Ligand binder design. Sequence first.
Ligand code: 78A
Length: 251
Amino acid sequence: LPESFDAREQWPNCPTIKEIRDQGSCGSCWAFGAVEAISDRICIHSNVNVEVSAEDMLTCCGGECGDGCNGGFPSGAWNFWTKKGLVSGGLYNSHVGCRPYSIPPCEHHVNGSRPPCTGEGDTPKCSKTCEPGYSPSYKEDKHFGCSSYSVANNEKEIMAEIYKNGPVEGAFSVYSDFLLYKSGVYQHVSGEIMGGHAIRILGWGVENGTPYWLVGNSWNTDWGDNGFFKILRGQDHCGIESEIVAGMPCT
Ligand SMILES: *[C@]1(C(=O)N[C@H](C(=O)N2CCC[C@H]2C(=O)O)[C@@H](C)CC)O[C@@H]1C(=O)NCc1ccccc1
C-alpha cells in the first residue's frame, strides 16, 4: 500500500468525495458519515453522481439505526441502505434530489455568519415522498446497497478497504480539545468527553513522521481544515480504528 492516499485525487470523477456537509443542530453524524461514503461508493462502483439523502437515512431508518438526532449506529445505517435503500437529497434549501436535508446549517464550535448550532434538535418526520417538482417518485428513487459489513480494527485492512472500494465510515471519542482543531494531526491530550462521533475516512498519509487518517467532518467547511481534519493513525487513537463500516452498491 502507498505511504499516502487521498480518495479525492484517486477518483477525480467523484466530486462528492471532496464535499463537506453540515448536519445542523442534530446528533445525526451516524447518518451523515454513512450517506457521504455511500454517495462516494455509488460513484466509484458504477462508472454516476448522486447526493444520497441524509434526510431519508436520518428520518426513516428508525430503531434499527438508533434514535435519530439523539445518535445512531453506523453499521445500522449501511443495513438500511441494503434493506430499504436511500433516495437522493442535497444540502438544506438546495432543492436538489428527492429529499434535501431539512435542518438548517449552523456554526459548529466556531464563529461565522450562520446562527450558532443549538445542538438540541428534533428528528424530522419520515416522509416517503419527494420534494415538489422532482422525479421520479420516492419509491422509484431508492438506491440500494448489496452488502453491509464491518472492517476489522486493523490499520492495514482499513487502508486496503479504502484503497480498493473507497471511503468508509468510522467513529471516535470526541473530547473538548478536538472542537478547536485547525490543522496538523490531531491527538487527544486534554478535555472532557463530549461523546461519540461518526465520520467519513477517505485516506491517510504521514505528516512530520506522524501517520494519520484523512477525515471529513459534517460541521460545514468553516470548521477545522476546510471541513476536514487529520487524526493519529495506527494506535486506535480515540477508537478511530475500532468501528469501521462500509458496503457495496448493487451491481
Ligand atoms: C453523533 C453526533 O452527531 N455527534 C454530536 C455532534 O457532532 N453535534 C451535535 C450538535 C451538532 C454537532 C456539533 O457538535 O457541532 C456530538 C455528541 C459530538 C460532540 O451523537 C451522534 C451519534 O450517532 N452518536 C452515537 C455513536 C454510535 C457509535 C459510534 C459513535 C457514535
